[model samples]
Target: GYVGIKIRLTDVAPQAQELFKKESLDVKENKVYLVAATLRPETMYGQTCCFVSPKIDYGVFDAGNGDYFITTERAFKNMSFQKRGYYKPLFTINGKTLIGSRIDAPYAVNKNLRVLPMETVLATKGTGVVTCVPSDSPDDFVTTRDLANKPEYYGIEKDWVQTDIVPIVHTEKYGDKCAEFLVNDLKIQSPKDSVQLANAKELAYKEGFYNGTMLIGKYKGDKVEDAKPKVKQDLIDEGLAFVYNE
Candidate 1:
């Protein structure tokens, strides 16, 4: 199962770039939400930045009530197939255009989290977009560090990388910010450390889900498994996310 999250777009003021399409959306006149899919809705609140691949293309769709959704054609098509067929696409753009643009994450503690690039973001995945939660994800933690290490090379501002690793699920086995702690303990030098990263990812997911305690948000102090579905339904009830089954 997958959940498509609706993250609001706040600022698309592209700095230091020449107009390519010679056009853009009127954010002042309408609400635009970037749909990013994730397995855990609880992780949504921990997002530091939204990760989109430079190589991918995204669609801008009209989602009624003057609201729009920016995501991939595949996901939008899946949305249509899944009974939300009324939504219509307005246009498409390269993911690189979203670089450095600021978006208001669902419930992120860190503010002004910009849309950043991650080489590992896959078009084959749900939503074709990823929101960074370094505290709980091995790939995210590693990718974030690499981006911070070479923002210029990535064509993004160094400050655009998420600054805080706010604690989310704390596991006795892996500790708080389990992904970061595991990455460090295993000495995962880079995102390319595929073998180590896979193990770390599995461990983070397992340990966090089984033995973790919630340390942030309204779910604070609750067991991760106990808090997860409640948090998911809370977002669903609030219309911040919609369930998508694969």
Candidate 2:
């Protein structure tokens, strides 16, 4: 029920690649991708940034063809096994180093997105690099707020956080920004409010899956339940994403 969404680094340089080689990161002649897996690909178009846990170390490895992916080794094992092929990391890099790196998030309204830190990102879940969908995901909403408010503490520029969250799914229950509405309605003041945040996640997901309508993209105005596949598959076909069943 997950998909590995390719978030391409826009600032790849020959010198940086060489330096990565010296530092034991993967070296590839082709394009490199920060593989961010998510369950809700439907909300991908509104993604503003990618989140990685600063505490986790990520592997840069082969993903077939001329591509290489950066993710936790735990995630790569799942894909490698599922693909019926053995794979291993060319090298490793900490998530903290990825912060502030610019990215090209496929299907996103914002052409320019950055890799940001989200302390709650589970190194054991997905690719450990989560896409930021603040309009729909309660966790993303709360995390982005914290990130923006104290960019100094996070060692990030305030401008790096894209606060212009474009709406993708809309419903009467929470309108276009369910995360914002739910968090505020439930008074979830911070990321530490786990119980409220989890509750809000379910409500937002259910409401969007049932009553929400697509507010943007090719399926604009279509029901969210019906639009998810169309959006999801087109992304796979476009080489911007791949199915990751687990």
Candidate 3:
């Protein structure tokens, strides 16, 4: 009965509540996985690393019978809190082991970013597996670039961090593109800030909806807000991912 999901439309909080009701049989205070989305695909070019909390128990789980992602027991616990069911951690591995791995980002249909090793991920939050979006996300930009030139410094393979963080959406407020502008404008100092930072999701959604334009994919030239669902659906349809409700 876990019900949090990432949505581009408004009323997200209420929508999640309703989903909890329907999926959990009208229970409140139940555990739910609060999914979040970002509009900065261009920033994927700059991802230095993804992180997870090593202290917590974690696993590689399969959703909808296919495709696996590494995440945390807290995420599963939240799912159970929503009355989904009892769950357990499957397996754990060193973050360094993720080097040379690849994960297909179907939602980012035209981008080349994939599953790779990074040192800055937090295992306690989100899906545990953070998507690298360097353009709109300044932290991702600096991390990826840093990883490319100094693999030994970050403790991962250099080329694994070499995939170009593609420029997909263009936002004026954030700069020529939002992420790049923010990275240079803010002059972020570290990945920890990126992990701890929280922006008003609603503002991000609105700006992307009203002002951002897609620079890649079948929906190229369309406003980003309008194309999000299309891209999400493509990911689901391709069997690369599914609507994981928890």
Superposed by TM-score, candidate 2 places the C-alpha of residue 225 at a distance from the truth, in angstroms, of 0.8
* Backbone clash total, candidate 1: 0
Worst 10 residues of 3 by lDDT: 2-11
On lDDT, the stronger of 1 and 3 is 1
Best by the lDDT measure? 2
TM-score of each: 0.92, 0.92, 0.63
Model 1 lDDT, full chain set: 0.82
Runs of candidate 3 with Cα error greater than 4 angstroms are 1-57, 62-69, 77-85, 107-120, 189-206, 244-246
Stretches of candidate 2 exceeding 4 Å from the true structure: 12-18, 21-29, 83-86
Residue 18 alpha-carbon offset, candidate 3, angstroms:
44
| Predicted structure 1, TM vs. truth | 0.92
Q: In terms of TM-score, which candidate is stronger, 1 or 3?
A: 1
**lDDT (C-alpha, whole model) for all candidates:** 0.82, 0.84, 0.46
